[PDB]
Design an enzyme around this catalytic site. Structure first.
Site, PDB file in Angstrom:
ATOM      1  N   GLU A 199       0.826  -1.210   0.000  1.00  0.00           N
ATOM      2  CA  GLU A 199       0.000   0.000   0.000  1.00  0.00           C
ATOM      3  C   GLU A 199       0.865   1.267   0.000  1.00  0.00           C
ATOM      4  O   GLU A 199       0.546   2.234  -0.711  1.00  0.00           O
ATOM      5  CB  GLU A 199      -0.992  -0.014   1.160  1.00  0.00           C
ATOM      6  N   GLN A 200       1.964   1.255   0.764  1.00  0.00           N
ATOM      7  CA  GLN A 200       2.854   2.409   0.788  1.00  0.00           C
ATOM      8  C   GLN A 200       3.373   2.670  -0.623  1.00  0.00           C
ATOM      9  O   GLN A 200       3.392   3.824  -1.087  1.00  0.00           O
ATOM     10  CB  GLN A 200       4.035   2.180   1.742  1.00  0.00           C
ATOM     11  N   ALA A 221       6.973   8.892   2.596  1.00  0.00           N
ATOM     12  CA  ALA A 221       8.124   8.045   2.860  1.00  0.00           C
ATOM     13  C   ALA A 221       8.185   6.943   1.811  1.00  0.00           C
ATOM     14  O   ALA A 221       7.153   6.497   1.301  1.00  0.00           O
ATOM     15  CB  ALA A 221       8.071   7.462   4.269  1.00  0.00           C
ATOM     16  N   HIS A 253       4.051   4.168   9.155  1.00  0.00           N
ATOM     17  CA  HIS A 253       2.695   3.612   9.022  1.00  0.00           C
ATOM     18  C   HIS A 253       2.710   2.096   8.865  1.00  0.00           C
ATOM     19  O   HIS A 253       1.739   1.424   9.194  1.00  0.00           O
ATOM     20  CB  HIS A 253       1.944   4.253   7.855  1.00  0.00           C
ATOM     21  N   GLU A 271       5.281  18.222   8.680  1.00  0.00           N
ATOM     22  CA  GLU A 271       3.987  17.546   8.610  1.00  0.00           C
ATOM     23  C   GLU A 271       3.191  17.699   9.920  1.00  0.00           C
ATOM     24  O   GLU A 271       3.298  16.864  10.817  1.00  0.00           O
ATOM     25  CB  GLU A 271       4.170  16.063   8.247  1.00  0.00           C
TER      26      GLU A 271
HETATM   27 ZN   LIG Z   1       1.643  10.069   8.016  1.00  0.00          ZN
END
Ligand SMILES: [Zn+2]
Ligand SMILES: [Cl-]
Ligand SMILES: [Zn+2]
Lengths: 187, 188
Positions: free
Chosen positions: B65-66, B87, B94, B152
Site C-alpha cells: 500500500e505504501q 516516505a 505507518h 507535517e
Molecule cells: Zn503520516
C-alpha cells in the site's frame, strides 16, 4: 475474474493470489482498489459531476483487517447486528479489491459499518449511472435470504460491462446472475 | 519496540513480522493501529473533548500500500512533492502501526497526502496534550535535514511515556532522541 462470487458459502481460496492494487481518487484518505475498478470509479464520478458530493469510504481490505473490523463490530454492536452488515473474514468482497463503500462528502460523524447513502440527490444520480460503468448494488433491500446480508445502499461491487447493466435491469443479485449463467450454459 | 527508528537510512527489515492490529475509533472509515496506540489515541481524544473536532485519517498500511501511495503521488504530484511528504516503501512508520495521520472535521478541503491540521483551536489543544498520552509530532518544521521529511503538522508517532514527554519538552525528533541515548551510553 471480475465475476467471482464471494460470500458465506463461497469464501475466498486460502491459496488465492492477492489482487493488483492502485490508490483510488475521490476519497479523503488512502483507499486502494484493483486498477480497472479505480479507473471506472473515477470515470463514473466525473461523468455524473459528483466530485464535490460523494466520497469513497472503503476499498481493499486484508483478511486480517476484515477480522479486526468484524471483532470491533461485535464488541460495539453485538453479534446479530454484525452478522447483518459485516461479511465474515474470508467472505468479504473487500478482500479482493472489487468492492467500494460510498458515502456523502460533507457527512460529518458518519458510521464506518453503515455509511449514510440515501435520501440525497447525489445518491439517486449515482444509482442512475453506476451500472453504466461496471458496478452493481451488491445487497438490495429484498434479497437478504439470497445474499445473506441485510440491505446496504452504500456497498457496490464491480463486475464490469455488460454484466452490471444486465444484473441491474433484472434487479438481480450476483448470486442469481451466477445461477442464470449456469442454467444458460446448458444449451 | 515502541522506540523503533524508521526512515530512509533505517528501513524496515523484510523479515520483521506484522504488528498486531485493532480497528481504531474516532474515524469515518476503517483505520487500524497497534492495540496500545489505539487505546492511547482513544484516551487522548476523550480527555481533550475533541470527539466532534478531529478525526483519524490514516494509520497502518502495508509496504505494498505504501508503494501504491508513493507511485500515485509520483504520478499526480511529481517527484519533488512526493520526496518531501511521502516516505519510501519500507521507510514509513505507518507500516508498523505506530503512526497516525490526524485531520479536522467540518472541512471542505484537505489534500490527500497532507491532511489539514493547522490554524485551529482543536489542533492547538491537541498539541498541548498529545505527549501526555505517548505521541510526538514526528516531522517538526525546522528539522527537515534531520528527518529527511518536510514539515507535517498532521503526522503523529506513538513512542509511549515518558519518551513522548521528554522528546516534546526538548523539541527533539526521534532521530535526536536516539543520538541522545547513544551519547549517554557512550559516557558510561
Ligand atoms: Zn503520516
Ligand atoms: Cl499492482
Ligand atoms: Zn462494504
Amino acid at each position: 475474474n471480475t465475476l467471482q462470487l464471494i460470500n458465506k458459502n463461497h469464501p475466498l481460496k486460502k491459496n488465492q493470489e492477492p489482487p493488483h492494487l492502485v490508490l483510488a481518487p475521490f476519497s479523503d484518505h488512502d483507499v486502494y482498489l484493483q486498477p480497472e475498478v479505480a479507473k471506472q470509479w473515477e470515470r463514473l464520478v466525473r461523468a455524473t459531476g459528483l466530485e464535490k458530493d460523494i466520497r469513497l469510504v472503503s476499498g481493499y481490505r486484508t483478511e486480517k483487517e476484515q477480522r479486526r473490523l468484524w471483532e470491533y463490530s461485535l464488541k460495539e454492536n453485538g453479534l446479530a447486528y454484525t452478522k447483518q452488515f459485516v461479511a465474515l473474514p474470508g467472505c468479504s468482497e473487500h478482500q479482493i479489491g472489487l468492492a467500494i463503500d460510498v458515502g456523502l462528502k460533507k457527512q460529518e460523524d458518519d458510521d464506518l459499518i453503515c455509511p449514510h447513502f440515501r435520501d440525497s440527490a447525489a445518491a439517486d444520480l449515482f444509482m442512475q449511472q453506476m451500472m453504466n460503468y461496471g458496478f452493481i448494488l451488491r445487497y438490495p433491500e429484498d434479497k437478504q435470504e439470497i445474499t445473506g446480508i441485510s440491505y446496504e445502499p452504500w456497498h457496490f461491487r464491480y463486475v464490469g460491462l455488460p454484466h452490471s447493466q444486465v444484473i441491474t435491469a433484472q434487479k438481480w443479485t450476483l448470486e442469481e446472475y451466477h445461477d442464470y449463467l449456469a442454467q444458460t450454459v446448458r444449451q
